[PDB]
Structure 1
């Protein structure tokens, strides 16, 4: 026997923003506090952690648009 695989996907796709102005943005949080206590940490085989992380962010992109795309073909 025999096999033909033809794979021809098309995007004419668009992702877009139009905006006049980003105005006035004030970010004024009051002062926080964090405390943590433990005795042992013991991590094995593919581990992530975050411990004790007081964190303030202002993020004002003039458009933050995106496209995420994937293709897979597998044959056996």
Structure 2
């Protein structure tokens, strides 16, 4: 079992104006289990110039 993720960003100018993230990279060799059951009322709000 070979799993590969490759990502590039190349920029003159790059911007992100507000972001939110719950579970990011979770690699597991033998096994992975996720039990995602929040009472979620989370908000992301932004006003931007770019």
Superposition TM-score tier, normalisation by shorter sequence: under 0.3
Normalising by structure 1, what TM-score? 0.22
Q: Which has the higher strand share?
A: 2
Normalising by structure 2, what TM-score? 0.27
Larger radius of gyration: 1
Q: Which has the higher contact order (CA 8 A, sep 6+)?
A: 2
